[PDB]
Design an enzyme around this catalytic site. Sequence first.
Site, PDB file in Angstrom:
ATOM      1  CB  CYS A   1      -0.909  -0.006   1.237  1.00  0.00           C
ATOM      2  SG  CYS A   1      -1.902   1.526   1.399  1.00  0.00           S
TER       3      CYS A   1
ATOM      4  CD  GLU B   1      -1.468  -8.760  -4.030  1.00  0.00           C
ATOM      5  OE1 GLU B   1      -1.713  -9.971  -3.882  1.00  0.00           O
ATOM      6  OE2 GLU B   1      -1.273  -8.256  -5.156  1.00  0.00           O
TER       7      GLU B   1
ATOM      8  CG  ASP C   1      -4.233 -11.425  -9.303  1.00  0.00           C
ATOM      9  OD1 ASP C   1      -3.227 -11.455  -8.562  1.00  0.00           O
ATOM     10  OD2 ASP C   1      -4.911 -12.466  -9.550  1.00  0.00           O
TER      11      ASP C   1
ATOM     12  CB  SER D   1      -1.583  -3.879  -8.224  1.00  0.00           C
ATOM     13  OG  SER D   1      -2.178  -4.578  -7.144  1.00  0.00           O
TER      14      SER D   1
ATOM     15  CD  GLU E   1      -6.738  -1.034  -3.335  1.00  0.00           C
ATOM     16  OE1 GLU E   1      -6.503  -1.463  -4.477  1.00  0.00           O
ATOM     17  OE2 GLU E   1      -6.637  -1.733  -2.312  1.00  0.00           O
TER      18      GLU E   1
END
Length: 299
Positions: free
Chosen positions: A30, A105, A107, A109, A184
């Site tokens: 993060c 977490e 995939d 990202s 996010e």
Amino acid sequence: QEPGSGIGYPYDNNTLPYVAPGPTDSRAPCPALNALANHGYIPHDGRAISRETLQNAFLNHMGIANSVIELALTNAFVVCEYVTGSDCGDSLVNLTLLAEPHAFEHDHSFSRKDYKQGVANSNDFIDNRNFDAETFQTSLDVVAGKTHFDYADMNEIRLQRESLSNELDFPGWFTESKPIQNVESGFIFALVSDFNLPDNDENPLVRIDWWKYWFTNESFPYHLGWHPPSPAREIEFVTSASSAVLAASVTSTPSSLPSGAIGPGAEAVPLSFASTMTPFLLATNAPYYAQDPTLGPND
Ligand code: HEM
Ligand SMILES: *[C@@H]1O[C@H](CO)[C@@H](O[C@@H]2O[C@H](CO)[C@@H](O)[C@H](O)[C@H]2NC(C)=O)[C@H](O)[C@H]1NC(C)=O
Ligand SMILES: *[C@@H]1O[C@H](CO)[C@@H](O[C@@H]2O[C@H](CO)[C@@H](O)[C@H](O)[C@H]2NC(C)=O)[C@H](O)[C@H]1NC(C)=O
Ligand SMILES: *[C@H]1O[C@H](CO)[C@@H](O)[C@H](O)[C@@H]1O[C@H]1O[C@H](CO)[C@@H](O)[C@H](O)[C@@H]1O
Ligand SMILES: *[C@@H]1O[C@H](CO)[C@@H](O)[C@H](O)[C@H]1NC(C)=O
Ligand SMILES: *[C@H]1O[C@H](CO)[C@@H](O)[C@H](O)[C@@H]1O
Ligand SMILES: *[C@H]1O[C@H](CO)[C@@H](O)[C@H](O)[C@@H]1O
Ligand SMILES: *[C@H]1O[C@H](CO)[C@@H](O)[C@H](O)[C@@H]1O
Ligand SMILES: *[C@H]1O[C@H](CO)[C@@H](O)[C@H](O)[C@@H]1O
Ligand SMILES: *[C@H]1O[C@H](CO)[C@@H](O)[C@H](O)[C@@H]1O
Ligand SMILES: *[C@H]1O[C@H](CO)[C@@H](O)[C@H](O)[C@@H]1O
Ligand SMILES: *[C@H]1O[C@H](CO)[C@@H](O)[C@H](O)[C@@H]1O
Ligand SMILES: *[C@H]1O[C@H](CO)[C@@H](O)[C@H](O)[C@@H]1O
Ligand SMILES: *[C@H]1O[C@H](CO)[C@@H](O)[C@H](O)[C@@H]1O
Ligand SMILES: *[C@H]1O[C@H](CO)[C@@H](O)[C@H](O)[C@@H]1O
Ligand SMILES: *[C@H]1O[C@H](CO)[C@@H](O)[C@H](O)[C@@H]1O
Ligand SMILES: *[C@H]1O[C@H](CO)[C@@H](O)[C@H](O)[C@@H]1O
Ligand SMILES: [Mn+2]
């Protein structure tokens, strides 16, 4: 920054300097937690972190209200129990365990590789936790030559990331995670949208240099005119932004998208793991820190 520098004033009147993580320090997947830890707003060693420590750090140093991280706190401690095998109470064991794959977490990202990205052998895995400049550049290049971007641009970025990950990840690994990713996405609009524009609160535009500074440096882009949002951003802004990203019209469609990638997304909800499940092994890489250039205490 150094408390006497006044760099945060009058939005943050009690700053602390940037200190790079050392090889024994624990860092997260993060960019926000890593920036807070690099300044010691949460422990610089990344260990033994209470909910109130996180709440206060986000509120007083990033302009992010408690409501924004309520679910994130719940899921951090769910993942802590899953990875360590026992209830962590109110002391998150470390930040590194948050890179447990296919959990919090996820995939595709924006700035990290995937756990099984490009591995030749199905048993192998790679660093899904530390900032990866080449990965982030694939996000940035969707908006190349621009100073700002909007919701539809962000939709295109996340579609590009999903297409690349679905092609490059070991077959069967890739798992789409629109709900967590686009919270996010909302987090990015909350932190680094351009509050100097008259319509920021209702039509936010991300300032790209602020975004790139925050992600690359894991520190705050004060030198570029950024400051913590004031008043602090609340959860309604974040989930409205998340919604609007996924509702935005797609003008350019990458191939190899997972099924249903274009369209609305489910509400993010608390994570849960069957007690029979054993956690995937965490990547062991030392914590990333910026080196091109290295940062000083006020950066
Ligand atoms: C207790 C609070 C928080 C926790 C436990 C947490 C946890 C995480 C985790 C586990 C990831 C990795 C997801 C992935 O695979 O990309 C992540 C990514 C991210 N976080 Fe945090 N988060 C918190 C709060 C925040 C806040 C408040 C912000 C910004 C205002 C933020 C910004 C981001 C961004 C932008 C990403 C995506 C990075 C990427 O896709 O490359 N986080 N967070
Ligand atoms: C990461 O942080 C550095 C340090 O703030 C950024 O800017 C450099 O700042 C120092 C002086 O503080 C000088 O080397 C240059 O003036 C800056 N470099 C430039 C403008 O290229 C650096 O740019 C940040 N990285 C990103 C990607 O934003
Ligand atoms: C953060 O905490 C996790 C969880 O305790 C650590 O991961 C475990 O580390 C031990 C070694 O001490 C291994 O035997 C386990 O297999 C690890 N668990 C998993 C799921 O991989 C991790 O090393 C800690 N990281 C830091 C930087 O402190
Ligand atoms: C983390 O540590 C494990 C034990 O050394 C390794 O088996 C993993 O491959 C992973 O290695 C990576 O990080 C370590 C730092 O602990 C480096 O020494 C390695 O070169 C590698 O980058
Ligand atoms: C910082 O200090 C100034 C001067 O006392 C004050 O006006 C301002 O409200 C303070 N900011 C915060 C966020 O407390
Ligand atoms: C961000 O939040 C919106 C609104 O809850 C979701 O639809 C999206 O999938 C992401 O979680
Ligand atoms: C974002 O979405 C949430 C539901 O997930 C709403 O509660 C919020 O007001 C915003 O529309
Ligand atoms: C929810 O809130 C966001 C941020 O204010 C808006 O951009 C969106 O249109 C919806 O009103
Ligand atoms: C954002 O907006 C979408 C549609 O406007 C909702 O479905 C979602 O729950 C969030 O409120
Ligand atoms: C919404 O709008 C774009 C143009 O901005 C269309 O091309 C797209 O197909 C979507 O329906
Ligand atoms: C349509 O617009 C998107 C951004 O909304 C671009 O990424 C695309 O190349 C096309 O110009
Ligand atoms: C429009 O934009 C998408 C995402 O940026 C690309 O994948 C596509 O090839 C076209 O350039
Ligand atoms: C690219 O193609 C998709 C369909 O696969 C459209 O939904 C999108 O708007 C763009 O035209
Ligand atoms: C994936 O496939 C489509 C055609 O089916 C193209 O739009 C794209 O360039 C990529 O080859
Ligand atoms: C392709 O596959 C997905 C499964 O995730 C469906 O959601 C979609 O409607 C299409 O059938
Ligand atoms: C949350 O949900 C899972 C099912 O996915 C359960 O196994 C778990 O114990 C918790 O109730
Ligand atoms: C990072 O560390 C290097 C080491 O030489 C310094 O040159 C730089 O000022 C930054 O503090
Ligand atoms: Mn990830």
